[PDB]
Paper text:
The C. jejuni CosR regulator is essential to the viability of this bacterium and is responsible for regulating the expression of a number of oxidative stress defense enzymes. CosR belongs to an OmpR/PhoB family of response regulators. We determined that CosR assembles as a homodimer with each CosR protomer contributing to major conformational changes to facilitate DNA binding.
Next, 8 mg/mL of purified full-length CosR was mixed with 2.6 mg/mL of 21 bp double-stranded DNA1, which contains two half-sites, S1 and S2, for dimeric CosR binding, and crystallization trials were again conducted. The best crystal of the CosR-DNA1 complex diffracted X-rays to 2.90 Å. Each unit cell of the CosR-DNA1 crystal contains two CosR protomers and one DNA duplex. One of the CosR protomers is bound at S1 of one DNA chain. Superimposition of these two CosR protomers gives rise to a very high root-mean-square deviation (r.m.s.d.) of 9.5 Å, suggesting that they are structurally very distinct from each other. The CosR protomer, designated CosR1, bound by the S1 site, has an elongated and extended conformation. However, the other CosR protomer that contacts the S2 site, designated CosR2, has a more compact conformation. However, by applying a crystallographic symmetry operator, it is found that CosR1 and CosR2 indeed tightly contact with each other and assemble as an asymmetric dimer to bind the DNA duplex. Interestingly, this CosR dimer appears to hold the two DNA1 chains together, where the two DNA1 align in such a way that the tail of the first chain contacts the head of the second chain.
Numbering used by the authors:
A (entry chain B): 1 to 220
B (entry chain A): 1 to 222
Write the structure that this text describes.
Amino acid sequence: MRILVIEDEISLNKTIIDNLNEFGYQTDSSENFKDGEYFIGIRHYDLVLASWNLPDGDGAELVNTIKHKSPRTSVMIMSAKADKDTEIKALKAGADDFVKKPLDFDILLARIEARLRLGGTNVIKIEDLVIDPDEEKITYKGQDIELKGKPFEVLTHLARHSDQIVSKEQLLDAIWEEPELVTPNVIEVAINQIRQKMDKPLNISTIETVRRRGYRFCFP
Amino acid sequence: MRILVIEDEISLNKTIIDNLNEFGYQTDSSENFKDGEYFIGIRHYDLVLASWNLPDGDGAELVNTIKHKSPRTSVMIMSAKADKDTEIKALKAGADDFVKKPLDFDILLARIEARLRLGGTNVIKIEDLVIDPDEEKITYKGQDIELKGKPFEVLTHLARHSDQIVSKEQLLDAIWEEPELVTPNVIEVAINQIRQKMDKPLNISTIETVRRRGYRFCFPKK
DNA sequence: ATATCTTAATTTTGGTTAATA
DNA sequence: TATTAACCAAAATTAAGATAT
């Protein structure tokens, strides 16, 4: 999952990115609405962390622009003014969460994880398939599967986004630090790794390929 | 601190106790050497203050006994005989100190504090794991683990920077000398011995490696 | 034709094992 | 012992051809 930060204050923007990266997220920062708006046009972000109090934005337009271009991107607003009405304006403007500044980073990461779970649970438990992304483990029928690294991350991403196709660019954007540089075959070798150690041996078809579209996780 | 008072005079013994509790010492009292030894068997007292003059009058036989049964305990002897011989013959009997009566409870309290001061320890202790850097002793749940040499110092530096991560270079500059003339693999072979000796038989990750970051001590278990 | 799938080589990054200063 | 050399395992990544659409 890729997070984007738009903090006008220089020090805060940094601290946030460092904490987020430590957790396990891919990250890009912005200090401007214009600079932000460019990023959201080149890359896909799973969540955007923006300040309502920016010099070059009203907040409400910021939240509106992003949720129009990237309609599946989540918007979390941060404000030093956590007033009742400031919050309501943000949420009404299309924000998905509102947090007060100064920040509790332990609570932020929890909400970020909840927002990227897509309504799911932390441990993804479909049938006898159990993917614990936190301990990096996949178990089917009590039997353990051995998938690790990027290849495991596209599987959880494909599972968080089940019954939906995910373009190779989004998998790149979500999991690789510099998605533009890596060749898009990294994604295909990963899917082969997954299928080889899951779909092929366990007589199943978890991932489906859709030409000029992407891949789609299924468990029918 | 637990101090034991063996005094024949009840007057004083109550006074000795009252001042000693006022300072925050656990304190038990007696008037019989027999009684004293009993407490010793059941509990460990950091110090025992006792009168040189008692009905028993065993003298050294008291100091030598207390030390024999419980050697980590100190013996301070109280007497109203101030003669040099009394003092000397008592200290030569094993007394760690000789105070005089009439008693100056102010001095008395200061001297007990000095006989009980522990000082500074470099020992690191976590759960069942204790790391004694001065004795080169790593014991887990009473089970000495055989880590020695640079591996030991590497483990120490990490523990001292627990949670935090230490670069291979930091470890090199600290534990090793002239880091410009050592193969960095020395750290890998060090972490291996560390894991091979402790992390493994202890069945709990001791050290964790972080990509391009190095290692950080991680003991969040038994 | 393109699109991707597989398999292989290569690179990176520590971990392991002995031997030998 | 402490230091090294050789060796292993793993991920990453890119390449190439194969195979499917």
